[PDB]
């Protein structure tokens, strides 16, 4: 069941006195005329922000509550009990029966304490303090929620520190409200007690009473608030995509190159896809170093370079920053601060031939290591030692570029592998290659949140009739506010009217005549009120 509070769950926000002073407060209250659960006789409830809790009987079936996050061990909780003797507050780590009505553990106790009817309680928990307000009124019924006003006086204060997310009850009819941040107007007696209140977010009369800070409004017309239409979503127009950026001249070429003279190709204005390259599931090595393979589809770049060649199978590990060997010492050196991805796959069915395919040579001898990302095609003699040969042969002279032998009748690791190395850089180029992106079409005649290639704003968009000279990006208004734009994609001018906004006034005949009310939304078109 569910029931309706009427004016219930008002507590003194603090100490301090007061005489006849309509005191306005902002705090956590139980809103007037709320939807309070009903329980008969129970289960684990939430807490989430304070709790109102009433109860009715002449016997004592309600024997305290239990609080916490897990209501067990492994985390701490509170326990508030009352046998026929008196109250027993307690804070340990417990083991609670899932249907408790005694416990089963009392470890690590960090706080102890020992020593019909309507009994209301307000529980809240702020800054490690667990506050409890309470009130005991006598009903002239037995167990139904009555009507009336009765303010709740503070009882306890516990500097625990405990976290709370759940609570229960203990039994040998009760309700559960929740508290939200509201603003109230409390009427104080001359002895200093709260006798009446106003919830200032109920209807127009209450909002007027709150605006005036009074309980009696005289006839008139009062500005009470404002309306403002709300904007949803946010378009993001952009000039025609651009390109598709093919790499068929990278991967799908008719032949790769040899590793002593590796080819290279840069990338310009493009839309470069990267997920569709990865998921083909035929790649021997796909190793991304400075980037994750799942973020490409979204990060713009400033320059992309592709290297491509053929090397054997037992040297694909050499294409990595900080290796050693005839492919990385002086054929292809990678710099240590690399950020691209090495892709490589076996090509024993293209670059292989019985009898041999000797197009693919490689340097096997060099004076020393060759820094990163340069090459050498200085095909000369090689010199061995203290002899002057200098271009003879035979007596330990050489030509330092040996061909490969690639037949299909050769074991793996000695087979041709095609290698494509991607390298990126990002310094300050304001518009370069980005992956497959997506925003959303444009809309009109609705207060919207828009972005037109940099112009960020809010408002209603409408078809224009202002001839934007073929060269005018937008429209400027005296006092300098953007009032027209041009769509990059379709190149049409659109006006940007502002989103409705306006005061709200309340018309009342006076509370001494009636409590009906009328409402004026000032210079707002009456079709966009709610």
């Amino acid at each position: 069941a569910y029931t309706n509070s009427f004016t219930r769950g008002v507590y003194y926000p603090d100490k301090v006195f007061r005489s006849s002073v309509l005191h306005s407060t902002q705090d956590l209250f139980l809103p007037f005329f709320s939807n309070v659960t009903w329980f008969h006789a129970n289960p684990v409830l939430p807490f989430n922000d304070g709790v109102y809790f009433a109860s009715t009987e002449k016997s004592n079936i309600i024997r305290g509550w239990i609080f916490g996050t897990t209501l067990d061990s492994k985390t701490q909780s509170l326990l508030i009990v009352n046998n026929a003797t008196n109250v027993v507050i307690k804070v340990c780590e417990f083991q609670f029966c899932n249907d408790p009505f005694v416990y089963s553990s009392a470890n690590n106790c960090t706080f102890e304490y020992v020593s019909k009817n309507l009994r209301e309680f307000v529980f809240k928990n702020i800054d490690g303090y667990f506050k409890i307000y309470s009130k005991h009124t006598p009903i002239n019924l037995v167990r139904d929620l009555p009507q009336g006003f009765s303010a709740l006086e503070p009882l306890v204060d516990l500097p625990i520190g405990i976290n709370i997310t759940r609570f229960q009850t203990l039994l040998a009819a009760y309700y559960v409200g929740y508290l939200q941040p509201r603003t109230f107007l409390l009427k104080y007696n001359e002895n200093g007690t709260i006798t009446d209140a106003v919830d200032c977010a109920l209807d127009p009369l209450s909002e007027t009473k709150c605006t005036l800070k009074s309980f009696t409004v005289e006839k008139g017309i009062y500005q009470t608030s404002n309306f403002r239409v709300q904007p949803t979503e946010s378009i993001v127009r952009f000039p025609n995509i651009t390109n598709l950026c093919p790499f068929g001249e990278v991967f799908n070429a008719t032949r790769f190159a040899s590793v002593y003279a590796w080819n290279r190709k840069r990338i310009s204005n493009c839309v470069a896809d990267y997920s569709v390259l990865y998921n083909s599931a035929s790649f021997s090595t796909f190793k991304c170093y400075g980037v994750s393979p799942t973020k490409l589809n979204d990060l713009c770049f400033t320059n992309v370079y592709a290297d491509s060649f053929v090397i054997r199978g037992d040297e694909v590990r050499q294409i990595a920053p900080g290796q050693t060997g005839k492919i990385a010492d002086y054929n292809y050196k990678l710099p240590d601060d690399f950020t691209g991805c090495v892709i490589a796959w076996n090509s024993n069915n293209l670059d292989s031939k019985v009898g041999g395919n000797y197009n693919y040579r490689y340097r096997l001898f060099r004076k020393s290591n060759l820094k990163p990302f340069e090459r050498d095609i200085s095909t000369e003699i090689y010199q061995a030692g203290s002899k002057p040969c200098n271009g003879v042969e035979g007596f330990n002279c050489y030509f330092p570029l040996q061909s490969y032998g690639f037949q299909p009748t050769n074991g793996v690791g000695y087979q041709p592998y095609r290698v494509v190395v991607l390298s990126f850089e990002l310094l300050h180029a304001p518009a370069t290659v980005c992956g497959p992106k997506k925003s959303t079409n444009l809309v009109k005649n609705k207060c919207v949140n828009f972005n037109f290639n940099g112009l960020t704003g809010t408002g209603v968009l409408t078809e224009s009739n202002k001839k934007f000279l073929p060269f005018q990006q937008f429209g400027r208004d005296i006092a300098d506010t953007t009032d027209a734009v041009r769509d990059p994609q379709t190149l049409e001018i659109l006006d940007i009217t502002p989103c409705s906004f306006g005061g709200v006034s309340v018309i009342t005949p006076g509370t001494n005549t009636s409590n009906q009310v009328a409402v004026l939304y000032q210079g707002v078109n009456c079709t966009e009120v709610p």
């Epitope: 991967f251 083909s280 035929s282 790649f283 796959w345 293209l350 031939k353 019985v354 299909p408 690791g413």
Partner: antibody, heavy 120, light 105 residues
């Protein structure tokens, strides 16, 4: 994928026989094919390979010089051309696919269902 | 590069599990395929590349092993799955099939 082979029968020791293998389904080019014999009452053993156009053919033992395998993707079949035979390679023959040429070739394998050749 | 299957014929009932081993003369990685040849049928393939079986082959067939030693396992096949088995490599040219292992009861 499908593979249909033809050219079986009874011959004499020193004739010839057209061993043809027809393929459909998957694209017959971009794909490496080969043959495999089995003498009835033995295991399995291969014959000859062809590499997606005739540039490189490898052969097995004791079949080099009597066997000219050729493919032709402009009519999408495969041939062994058994020629001047022996009375000891009476067997069953299967054309199968080695697989893959490019990176986008999605290697799948498939076999025929046999072609029986017998001698006198 | 010659394959071999060293366990000979076995007599495992319709139940229990069977484990069949295939070697290689040198290093072959993720390149083997298993065939199950009945008496007088076409050799039906089992397992793509040491780990995933093809379509129409149930889950009780599993294929694993690495380095140079590979293994096919029958968890609890059924009351028929008795034939000869072959391991083949697709590393280089050409694909050698090995020897073969029968199973009886």
């Amino acid at each position: 994928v499908q593979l249909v082979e033809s050219g079986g029968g009874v011959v004499q020791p020193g004739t010839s026989l057209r061993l043809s293998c027809a393929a459909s389904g998957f694209s017959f080019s971009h794909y490496v094919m080969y043959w495999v014999r089995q003498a009835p009452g033995k295991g399995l053993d291969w014959v000859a390979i062809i590499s997606f156009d005739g540039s490189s053919q490898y052969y097995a033992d004791s079949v080099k010089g009597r066997f000219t395998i050729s493919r032709d993707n402009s009519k999408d079949t495969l041939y062994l051309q058994m020629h001047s035979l022996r009375p000891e390679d009476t067997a069953v023959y299967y054309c199968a696919i080695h697989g893959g040429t490019y990176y986008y070739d999605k290697n799948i394998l498939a076999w025929g269902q046999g072609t029986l050749v017998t001698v006198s | 590069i010659r394959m071999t299957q060293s366990p000979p014929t076995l007599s495992l009932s319709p139940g229990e599990r069977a484990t069949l081993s295939c070697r290689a003369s040198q290093s072959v990685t993720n390149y083997l395929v298993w065939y199950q040849q009945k008496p007088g049928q076409a050799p039906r393939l089992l397992i793509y590349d040491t780990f995933n079986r093809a379509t129409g082959i149930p889950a009780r067939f599993s294929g694993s092993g690495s380095g140079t030693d590979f293994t096919l396992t029958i968890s609890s096949l059924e009351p028929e799955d008795f034939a000869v088995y072959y391991c083949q490599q697709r590393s280089n040219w050409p694909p050698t099939f090995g020897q073969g292992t029968k199973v009886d009861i």
